[PDB]
């Protein structure tokens, strides 16, 4: 029988708040009488500075002169192309031929002089990859704030699924009986784990015998959480790569070689195929199985042949 009416008192009301007691009862007589909030130079958030006559707002570090909050300049702060527009070279000394005599003064640098002239008439900004670079690799895409995101990165979960997903069903599925994770909706069959050939769904009378399973983000291969060394599921961050695919980077100490893959090429003319030799090609990986960046149409016979040849070569040592 909670009573927040009379037992709530008057000096201290509902907490995480205050009341008029600290102001009305505080007499001491002992002394006896245009701007933007998107930072259109790196498309991120943080501490902001803005110009009086310019709607563009930048970051403290996203400027050609790097300044800090502890020693910010006094008075008006006013932009680089704003220096070119609201100040000199556009208000007085009108732009008639200043570009040309900039070459005439800077000792015939004309092939880069117009770019150097346009440098001052341009906002300082973070690096952005061009469109024609990005369309070359279809597996990568731009993030929300402008970050790298290949196929290795999982899509962010929606806020509806992230927070309001009821109480019994958790995102990591660590509580209560959850038989829907063991049955795929593609065919209605049971997800057989790769290591142990058991779904291990268990029973409702004995929930403790249930073993958690997860599908792969690439080949949809089921895997138990106890077979692979792993505590809980993978829901935020990169996509859960099962330990059965080609790693992006391997280490072979010899100092060492990284071989950070080649992250695939679109179906345009850059993707070139030429199968010629199956034994001793030395193609350093980057193959595909069939029934510049050079890739070969390798098959089961060629891989098995060269693997046997290498292991018969190395068994003297």
């Amino acid at each position: 029988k909670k009573r927040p009416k009379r037992l709530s008192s008057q000096n201290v009301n509902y907490d995480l708040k205050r009341r008029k007691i600290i102001t009305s009862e505080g007499i001491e007589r002992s002394f006896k009488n245009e701007n933007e909030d998107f930072c259109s130079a790196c498309n991120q958030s943080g501490s902001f500075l803005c110009c009086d006559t310019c709607p563009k707002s930048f970051h403290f570090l996203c400027l050609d002169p790097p300044i800090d909050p502890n020693n910010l300049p006094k008075g008006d702060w006013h932009c680089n192309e704003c220096k070119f527009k609201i100040f000199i070279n556009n208000s007085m000394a009108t732009l008639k031929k200043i570009e040309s005599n900039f070459i005439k003064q800077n000792n015939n640098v004309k092939i880069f002089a117009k770019l150097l002239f346009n440098i001052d008439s341009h906002n300082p900004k973070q690096f952005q990859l061009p469109n024609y670079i990005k369309e070359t690799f279809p597996a990568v895409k731009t993030g929300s704030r402008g970050q790298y995101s290949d196929e290795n990165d999982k899509i962010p979960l929606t806020d509806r699924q992230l927070f309001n997903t009821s109480y019994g069903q958790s995102i990591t599925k660590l509580d209560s009986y959850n038989p829907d994770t063991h049955i795929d909706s593609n065919s209605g069959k049971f997800l057989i784990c790769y290591k142990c050939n058991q779904t291990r769904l268990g029973s409702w009378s004995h929930p403790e015998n249930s073993r958690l399973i997860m599908t792969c983000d690439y080949c949809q291969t089921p895997w138990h959480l106890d077979c692979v060394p792993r505590a809980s599921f993978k829901n935020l961050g990169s996509k859960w790569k099962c330990p059965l695919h080609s790693p992006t980077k391997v280490y072979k100490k010899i100092n060492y070689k990284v071989w950070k893959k080649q992250r695939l090429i679109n179906k345009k003319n850059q993707l070139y195929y030429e199968p010629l030799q199956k034994i001793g090609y030395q193609n350093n990986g980057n193959i595909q199985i069939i029934p510049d960046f050079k890739i070969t149409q390798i098959d089961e016979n060629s891989i098995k042949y060269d693997f046997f040849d290498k292991i018969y070569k190395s068994k003297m040592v």
Partner: protein, 181 residues
């Protein structure tokens, strides 16, 4: 106006984007090879390779223009927001050292590749003669193939987690805090 880039340096640029934005790895600015010696070696090699029919003057003009453009463009369209604070540290150090610091003495060729990649967006954004456009894009092609012939000694894949020199260093928590804050 169109410019093409060989796929090795495109992959290098994409790996740079992944290292900075995703892996949070800034380039090792105290490096062995910088932009100035890159262009110096390019000039020397393509000078001793071919004859001298008068192309050495435009060679020197192109390399000087590239050096000046990299000097005055480095903090304008290059330099990811993560690396802005790193730029701030050495600019403050040069202010304390009473010396003028220009990019080409400490910055590596990856930022030059970034500038090459973003070149067409300012080539299309400025009013300039077509013959000079073709000359610029051509000299860009020779610089690109020369960098392709020397990609192993200049862009070697190394992990900073176990090697002293990898043309890349891992970012600290505090560095990331100031950079993204």
């Amino acid at each position: 106006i169109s410019l093409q880039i060989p796929i090795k340096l495109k992959s290098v640029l994409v790996d740079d984007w992944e290292y900075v934005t995703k892996d949070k790895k800034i380039c090792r600015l105290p490096a062995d090879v910088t932009v100035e010696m890159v262009l110096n070696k390019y000039e020397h090699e393509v000078s001793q390779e071919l004859e001298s029919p008068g192309s050495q003057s435009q060679l020197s003009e192109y390399c000087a223009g590239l050096k000046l453009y990299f000097d005055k463009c480095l903090g304008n369209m290059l330099l990811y927001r993560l690396e802005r604070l790193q730029y701030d540290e050495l600019l403050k150090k040069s202010s304390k050292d009473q010396k003028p610091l220009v990019p080409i003495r400490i910055y590596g060729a990856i930022h030059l590749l970034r500038l090459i990649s973003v070149l067409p967006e300012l080539i299309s954004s400025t009013t300039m003669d077509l013959q000079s456009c073709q000359l610029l894009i051509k000299q860009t092609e020779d610089f690109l193939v020369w960098l392709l012939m020397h990609v192993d000694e200049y862009f070697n894949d190394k992990d900073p987690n176990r090697s002293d020199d990898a043309l890349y260093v891992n970012t600290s928590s505090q560095y990331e805090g100031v950079a993204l804050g």
